[PDB]
From a paper:
Glutathione transferases (GSTs) constitute a widespread superfamily of enzymes notably involved in detoxification processes and/or in specialized metabolism. In the cyanobacterium Synechocsytis sp. PCC 6803, SynGSTC1, a chi-class GST (GSTC), is thought to participate in the detoxification process of methylglyoxal, a toxic by-product of cellular metabolism. GSTCs were shorter of about 30 residues compared to most cytosolic GSTs and had a well-conserved SRAS motif in the active site (10SRAS13 in SynGSTC1). The crystal structure of SynGSTC1 in complex with glutathione adopted the canonical GST fold with a very open active site because the α4 and α5 helices were exceptionally short.
We also solved the structures of two variants (S10T and R11A variants in complex with GSH) which did not show significant differences from the wild-type. The substitution of S10 by a threonine residue slightly decreased the optimal pH of the enzyme (6.9 vs. 7.4 for WT) and the catalytic efficiency (kcat/Km) of the protein (2.1 × 105 M−1·s−1 for S10T vs. 3.7 × 105 M−1·s−1 for WT). This result was consistent with the crystal structure of S10T which was superimposable to the wild-type. The bulkier threonine side chain did not impair GSH binding. Indeed, the GSH apparent affinity (Km) was not altered in the S10T variant. Furthermore, a sequence analysis of GSTCs (see below in Section 3.5) showed either a serine or a threonine as the first residue of the active site motif (10SRAS13 in SynGSTC1). Indeed, the OG atom invariably retained the same orientation in all structures (wild-type and variants), and was hydrogen bonded to the main chains of A7 and A12. S10A remained effective even though the decrease was greater than for S10T, being divided by 10 and 1.2 in S10A and S10T, respectively, compared to WT.
Author numbering:
A (entry chain B), B (entry chain A): 1 to 183
C-alpha cells in the first residue's frame, strides 16, 4: 500500500484528505520533525530536502504535496486523459501551492493580494459548485485546503465573499475532510 | 504556434527559455503590467487571477509557469510516459515554484532555509551535470531559473556551493537562455 510520511499539523493532512476521498488504504509513517528525524540520512533518502509530506509506493518515492495529489489522482483515473486535461489540473495545483498560498499567507503581500484572489475565486465559485464545475475533484482538495487554513491560521473569515464562504463550509462538512484536516 | 503572454522582468522569460530549448516558434504578446492591462477583461478571460505568464495553444489556454512548463514538456515528448515519470517531473516543478522560491526569497525564512536548500542541491549537482542526471530537462529550466535569480535579486553568490555555481554558470551560457532570460 502507499506509505505517507508526515507529522502532526503539516500538509500531510491534505494528502490524508484525498486518500479518504479516494477510499484508499495507506500506512502513516510519523517523522519526528521536533527532534530532527527529517534531517537525518534515512529520511533524506526519501526527500533530499527533508520536508513532509512524501510517499513511497513500492520502490517509487515522491515528495511535494502537489505532486503527490496529482499522482494519486492519475493513479485513480478510470478514463485516459490527454496533456490538456492534465494541464488544467496541474494549473490549479501550482496555483494552490504558489500564487494562492503566497497571496494569503505572506504578510508583506497579503493586503494587496488576498482581496484580489478572493474576488476572482468569488466569481468562479458563484458560477459552479466546485472549481472544475459540477463535480468535486483533486483541485478542490488543493485549493480548498489552502482556503480552509485561513480561519485556522490567520483568524480571518470569508464574510465578504459568500460563494467562497459557502464553498469552504461545504468542504469542511465533508466526512472525508472531518476524518483528516478537520480531526 | 503557441502564443505566450508575458512582460519584461517576469517568469514569462522562463517559458521563452524552454520554448527556445525545444526549438519551437511562439508568438510573444506583451501585457503592460505597469498600465494595468493584466487586470482588464481580455486578459482576465485568459488568467482570471491577472498574472503572467499564460499561453494559448489554439483554443486551449493555460496559466501558472509551472503548469505551462509541464504541458510543453508533455507535448514535446516522443516516448510516452506513465504517472511515475510525470510525477518526478511534477515534483521538481512544484519544488521550484514553492519550497525553493520561498526558502530563497522570503527574508523571514531565508537564514534557516537557504543553506539547507543549497546544501541539498550541491550534493545532487556534484553527482550529475543536470538535476535528473546526464541530460538537460524541463526540471533544469524550472529549478535553474530560480537559482539564476539569486545573484540578480539578493546580491548573493554561490561561492560556498561550487557545483551549484558551475551548474548556474552553464545554464546562463546556453544559447536558449541568452535568447530569453539573458536578453
Ligand atoms: N511545498 C512543500 C512544502 C513542504 C513543507 O514545507 N513541509 C514542512 C511541514 S508543513 C516541513 O517538512 N518542514 C520541515 C523543515 O523545514 O525542517 C509541499 O507542499 O509539500
Ligand atoms: N505562480 C505564478 C506567479 C505569476 C506571477 O506572480 N506573475 C507576476 C509577474 S512575475 C504578475 O503577473 N504580477 C501581476 C500582479 O500581481 O498584478 C507563476 O509561476 O506563473
Amino acid at each position: 500500500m502507499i506509505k505517507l510520511y508526515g507529522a502532526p499539523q503539516t500538509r500531510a493532512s491534505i494528502i490524508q484528505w484525498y486518500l479518504e476521498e479516494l477510499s484508499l488504504p495507506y500506512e502513516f509513517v510519523n517523522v519526528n520533525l521536533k527532534e530532527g528525524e527529517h534531517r537525518q540520512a534515512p529520511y533524506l533518502a526519501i526527500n533530499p530536502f527533508g520536508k513532509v509530506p512524501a510517499i513511497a509506493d513500492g520502490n517509487f518515492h515522491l515528495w511535494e504535496s502537489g505532486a503527490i495529489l496529482l499522482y494519486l489522482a492519475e493513479k485513480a483515473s478510470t478514463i485516459p486523459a490527454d496533456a490538456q486535461a492534465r494541464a488544467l489540473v496541474n494549473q490549479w495545483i501550482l496555483f494552490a501551492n504558489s500564487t494562492l498560498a503566497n497571496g494569503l499567507f505572506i504578510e508583506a503581500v497579503r493586503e494587496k493580494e488576498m482581496p484580489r484572489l478572493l474576488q476572482s475565486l468569488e466569481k468562479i465559485l458563484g458560477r459552479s459548485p466546485f472549481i472544475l464545475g459540477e463535480k468535486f475533484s483533486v483541485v478542490d482538495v488543493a485549493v480548498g485546503s489552502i482556503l480552509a487554513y485561513v480561519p485556522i491560521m490567520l483568524k480571518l473569515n470569508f464574510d465578504d465573499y459568500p460563494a467562497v464562504a459557502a464553498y469552504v463550509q461545504g468542504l469542511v462538512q465533508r466526512p472525508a475532510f472531518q476524518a483528516s484536516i478537520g480531526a
